[PDB]
Structure formats: C-alpha cells, structure tokens
Amino acid sequence: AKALIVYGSTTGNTEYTAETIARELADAGYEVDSRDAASVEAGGLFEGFDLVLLGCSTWGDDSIELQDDFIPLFDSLEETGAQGRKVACFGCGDSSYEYFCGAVDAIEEKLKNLGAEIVQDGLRIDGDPRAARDDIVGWAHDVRGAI
Numbered sequence: 001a002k003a004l005i006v007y008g009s010t011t012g013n014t015e016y017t018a019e020t021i022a023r024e025l026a027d028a029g030y031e032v033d034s035r036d037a038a039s040v041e042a043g044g045l046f047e048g049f050d051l052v053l054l055g056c057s058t059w060g061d062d063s064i065e066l067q068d069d070f071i072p073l074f075d076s077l078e079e080t081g082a083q084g085r086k087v088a089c090f091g092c093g094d095s096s097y098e099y100f101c102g103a104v105d106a107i108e109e110k111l112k113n114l115g116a117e118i119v120q121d122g123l124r125i126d127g128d129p130r131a132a133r134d135d136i137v138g139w140a141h142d143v144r145g146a147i
C-alpha cells in the first residue's frame with residue numbers, strides 16, 4: 001500500500017502525531033511518505049497514493065484558523081487529485097475552545113465535496129498527543145483495516 005502523510009504543525013504536536021501514525025503504518029508493511037505541509041505542493045500531490053492522511057492543528061480561538069503551514073494546501077485541495085482517493089484526517093486541539101479541532105472538520109468536508117473517500121472519521125486529539133498515544137496507535141490501526 002502506498003501512503004502519503006501531510007502535516008501542518010505549529011508547536012509540533014500534530015507532527016509527533018504524524019510520526020506515530022507513520023511508524024504504525026511502516027510496522028504494518030506500508031510504504032510511508034511523510035511530508036511537512038511547509039514544503040508541499042498541491043498539483044497532483046496525492047497521485048500514486050493508495051492512502052492520504054491529512055493532519056493539522058486548530059488555532060483561532062474565536063474563529064477557526066488552520067495551522068499556518070497548512071492553509072495554502074487547504075486553499076488548493078481541488079488540485080491534489082482527491083476524487084476517489086481513500087483519505088483520513090487528524091489533528092491536535094483543545095476542547096476548551098469553542099471550535100475543538102475545527103481544522104479536522106474543515107479538511108474532511110472539503111475532501112468529501114471533492115469526491116474523496118473518508119475511510120475513517122478524523123482523529124481529534126485534545127491535549128498532548130504523547131498522552132493519547134494509544135488513541136493514535138488504534139486510529140492508525142483502524143484506517144488500515146478500512147482500506
């Protein structure tokens with residue numbers, strides 16, 4: 001299986017998360033391409049991937065704002081080759097804000113209108129993902145099983 005993992009992380013929580021999902025994947029026999037959104041490009045980004053996992057933190061406080069590095073890609077999802085593509089989304093937040101992990105919400109929806117297949121619902125980590133370590137391992141686990 002060929003997986004793509006793209007992430008936008010500010011204080012590196014979602015990045016740690018991405019790393020955990022990657023190693024879970026890799027340990028299962030998947031080929032894993034892990035990329036910081038800082039550096040990526042949308043034009044056919046997803047082409048040649050059997051699985052695309054999108055990760056992003058939630059900022060904003062009183063409105064939803066996507067992790068900084070992430071926005072540009074988000075603006076361009078219609079150009080990644082998403083349709084028919086099998087995808088899952090993940091991100092860090094804090095349940096204390098009005099819009100808990102609203103960036104996961106946003107991304108999936110856009111994916112969905114694009115014609116992508118959400119094979120599993122989004123992992124919405126509240127707090128330090130080093131403290132949800134298991135959750136992480138388990139969601140990685142169910143995404144494989146739903147492909």
Ligand SMILES: Cc1cc2nc3c(=O)[nH]c(=O)nc-3n(C[C@H](O)[C@H](O)[C@H](O)COP(=O)(O)O)c2cc1C
Pocket residue numbers: 008009010011012013014015056057058059060061062063064065067092093094095097098099100101102127
């Ligand atoms: C000023 C600020 C605003 C935040 N706003 C939101 C928010 O609107 N929704 C939410 O789920 N979490 C929110 N959070 C918290 C985070 O997303 C949390 O810090 C996450 O662990 C950061 O991830 P990262 O390092 O990958 O970028 C905010 C954090 C700060 C400091």
